[PDB]
Design a protein around this ligand. Sequence first.
Ligand SMILES: [Cl-]
Ligand SMILES: [Cl-]
Ligand SMILES: [Cl-]
Ligand SMILES: [Cl-]
Ligand SMILES: [Cl-]
Lengths: 262, 260, 255, 266, 252
Amino acid sequence: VEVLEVKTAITEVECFLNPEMGDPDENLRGFSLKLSVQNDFSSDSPQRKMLPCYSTARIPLPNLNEDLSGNLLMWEAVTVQTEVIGITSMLNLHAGSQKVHEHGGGKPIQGSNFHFFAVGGEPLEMQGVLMNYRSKYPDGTITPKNPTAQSQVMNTDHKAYLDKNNAYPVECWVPDPSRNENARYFGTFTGGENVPPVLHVTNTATTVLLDEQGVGPLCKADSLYVSAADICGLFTNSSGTQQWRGLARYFKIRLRKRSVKN
Amino acid sequence: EVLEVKTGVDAITEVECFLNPEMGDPDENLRGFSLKLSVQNDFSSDSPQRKMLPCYSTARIPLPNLNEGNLLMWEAVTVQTEVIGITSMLNLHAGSQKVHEHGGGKPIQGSNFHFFAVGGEPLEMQGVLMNYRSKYPDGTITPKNPTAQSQVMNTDHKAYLDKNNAYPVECWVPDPSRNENARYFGTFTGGENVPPVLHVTNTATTVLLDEQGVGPLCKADSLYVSAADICGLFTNSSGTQQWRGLARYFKIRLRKRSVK
Amino acid sequence: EVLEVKAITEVECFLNPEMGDPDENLRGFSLKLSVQNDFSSDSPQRKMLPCYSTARIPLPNLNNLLMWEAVTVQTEVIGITSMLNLHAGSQKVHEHGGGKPIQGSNFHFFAVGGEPLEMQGVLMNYRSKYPDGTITPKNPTAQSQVMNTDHKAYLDKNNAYPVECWVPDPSRNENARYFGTFTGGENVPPVLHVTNTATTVLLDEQGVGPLCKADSLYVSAADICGLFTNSSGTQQWRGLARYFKIRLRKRSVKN
Amino acid sequence: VEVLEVKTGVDAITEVECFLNPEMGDPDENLRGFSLKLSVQNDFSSDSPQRKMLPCYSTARIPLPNLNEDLTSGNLLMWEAVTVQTEVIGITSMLNLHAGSQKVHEHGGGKPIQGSNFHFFAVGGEPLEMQGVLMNYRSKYPDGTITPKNPTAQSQVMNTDHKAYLDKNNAYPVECWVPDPSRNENARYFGTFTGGENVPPVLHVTNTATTVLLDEQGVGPLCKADSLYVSAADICGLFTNSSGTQQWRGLARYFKIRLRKRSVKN
Amino acid sequence: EVLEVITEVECFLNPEMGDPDENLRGFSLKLSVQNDFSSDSPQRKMLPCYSTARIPLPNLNNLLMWEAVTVQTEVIGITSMLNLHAGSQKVHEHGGGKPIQGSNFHFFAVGGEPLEMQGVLMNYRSKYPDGTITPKNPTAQSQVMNTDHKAYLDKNNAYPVECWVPDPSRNENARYFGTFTGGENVPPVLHVTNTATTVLLDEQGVGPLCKADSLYVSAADICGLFTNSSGTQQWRGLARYFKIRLRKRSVK
Ligand SMILES: [Cl-]
Ligand SMILES: [Cl-]
Ligand SMILES: [Cl-]
Ligand SMILES: [Cl-]
Ligand SMILES: [Cl-]
């Protein structure tokens, strides 16, 4: 794709992208199944509803080319406003949660969290890395194929497109920094038992998606792809069991028309 | 729709206010606190009492009347804001659990939320529930007729923050798909031992102009301020826990703007 | 009011903390904390209550008037390394261990103004009975636990206004600059920086600094570093002095 | 490793990409990326750590295209490293709390990886220059490791004898060596150490972050003998087994380095 | 006397943590606590001290003086704390050794004369041991600000860190920077890079001027407490590297 000048035209698209934490029954939307532990890497068979997955959505756009002429037009993503939706819901310390102590309130959601988004002109490109190459992953998941011990560090065979919602477990996959030429991604992982969730909301924060040459992701087939993972931490039930809790992510993307050489 | 800043005599004004927190106020002596937290064992039977639920604060500030070809509107340019009474938490001598024998009282700490908005209309809110089956009490305005989807994103839960001491903080967030004519800022920090960290200074200003140099435009010459400042949990002698909240100060500088 | 800059001077001051000073050996400490079970009966002893520090620095009487204008301040908390003494009087972290560090709730605050600091009263417990020698909100109500606009005071006496009762008032102080950070919690680590390379500019948007009314400069502070835990598990506030170096210039104003 | 000629000519850019594997010990064929369980001796006088328990610095030398047709010219061309994009690969694999880990409490999830960590990279036109410093100069280091020679008690602070090139992968223990700030004129290095048994790992990924490698004079590392040197250490923290034993977990580091052709005096 | 306007000096300054025997260079003696302020007699080897070195500069001699323009500085050997296999308390049964952690202080100064210090004490009644220089004739005011307690950092391994701070009312001809982090479980956080430079020029563009052709470097790098198998605690410190760029300035 030879990139020419901006047309001077604009549009905004938006999306609330639901989280995919596992959803173990019809009432526990936004949560995973309780975490179970197998004593040994040798026999690790997690249930599907226990595994948070990456979220993704394809936003279709109208074709711009009256004829395909020497030059074509593509939608170009310029900026994104994004935020995690429902952060104040973790102030519900009155239902279902283990008491911090006798006569005390419920335990807050806390622990390992991951907050990730991407905007691209094509599906997010992912690289597989496993904690345990011998994990047996369940039907409905898409995980690294024919993993080896090298899969626990870096095995260049584990390449995937984030091409299915609620299928790619967050624990098996990361955005691939060796690809994603036509997407921008941003993530923070914070690990530990007692990590406090720290979440910010503001409508004043804009991420610019333009690269060094002033070019944003280009919607090559007239579609825009948004991707997310927002594991906020672990909910501790009265019983002591733990479940992931996730929140939806809002996207507002400003697009403009870009001329490219046919 | 937005034309030139109008300068001249009386083309600038400044308004200020203190917005009290709405933490629940469980009796006539415990203004600024919630009722003690109680925990029900299951999502199926979650019935919080009204006085246990901190709510969003909000007020409408009138501005000098402007005439309704271009409309004139007040444009909010800057805000100075801070939480009032942060040093009150250095009272460790009254009603608080002893950190240990011979020790002082337990500081306020734990989950906190600090939030403010300045807009030309009421703040627009999106509903999200920890537990869609929560039974909320009379006197609250909470997401109407919630479903399992209401635990993640249900687009039916749209509201204006149009009543003080009514919209529980746990049910509602600012809606990033709306608020075209407002600026909002919030930080949630969760966890049992989270330390409150609060800054005061009369030298810090937030600029409310967007990328085009336009601030919120005040419809019907009204400015809307919103806040929630849950500082954390106060731990009584017996180990019961209550929310503590503090008031928020606003000083807002405005200018006249030609429109449409 | 304010015309052109006319004529330089520097003043410096070390302002001692007022942590309660429970006896003549424990200067810089409060009396041990005691807890009363209920808000209905809360009568803190004077020596248990840290208070705001303040000094008035007189300046040459220059009298269209001329006024001293505060332009910059360099400020530093003095003695932060004294907290590395874990061999004197502190609870052992465990058997065979060293002493427990100073830690917990802290407040670091200073102000420079051309008049006394304007303060707003807010109370944890309106029914608190404060001791003789303290100045605290008069006629408090339940509304004094949030915002009660009656509670307005000038910081006009050293070692009298308890830190727990008063904050700088953001609705006043047009003629002062203030800065504070409160960090609350049982195990909060003190974090303190020193450098002689940091200057705070005191000029407002129009390039005007605080103007010294009646040729006086006012410095204010509170530096509660945390709690010292003694051998038996008692807790006391520890505070440190604050240094100020203020550059002033002469400013013309309208008569 | 991929070496891609993005542009040819005087304004030639070469992009070098590579994934550098961590060297945490690899105690068995199934625990690639982990150390051997930590064991503690009572005393400094009897400290003999096992080889597979000691994480080592990762390093590779990447050969670049020859630039000089005529070796006899008054001026020669060198590859100059101008930018690097880097990140740690597989950070989400720490969300597996279901495999082999101590429960946080009865009926709870697995304990996350946490504790002391070190995240470090370097890009240079020669091997990284290292200075030795030991916790305990009387440590007896195992065969297969390269550690400070004839250390003294002064080796626990600064002993200027302990100079080394990071010239072998999986051999220089992270605990014995740091980058030498008195040398490395032709390399850029960046590291953060965070110590404590409850330290949470905090790791960021983005394809938008670039580090500029030019010094004050606008000059990047110059690749001597057409050689680019990448080095890393990414100890994420400790994994706690069901038994309560603790092992280091490491992750691979990606590098994307942009290089230009600089004329230098022969 | 400063009128108008190159060399690089470098130093590895060793830490002075106490060094309780020939094998524990870089550590302090185990901590002991006395129950009361009235009876506080710490042993010399238990007390970390400020490090300092006088660095001779080429003689130049209306007069010319070396002016310090920039410093690069780094704490040396931070990865040594990844030894959790040697002499440390186990964090739980079968677990690894306890990391170095707790109270820390990281400080450096570059000056054209010795660092000027102000005394402040946790406990004015402490009796300090022979070989230390501590506040003379301390009073209860020594717990806050007592202007009697002025000293020059004029001796390596003599001025205990717990007794002295840099004096912000002096040091007109030096630049200093320190951070104190207090508490039992504070994690050490230490950064290395050869890309970071501190400019030493004041707002007028003048760096420290080297009197008697001498440059003074000062440090304190208490990393935290090492907890041995028995539960005893000792300070651990690391060396600090300095690389200082100097230029010639005409004075009178
Ligand atoms: Cl695969
Ligand atoms: Cl609704
Ligand atoms: Cl009053
Ligand atoms: Cl060696
Ligand atoms: Cl003295």
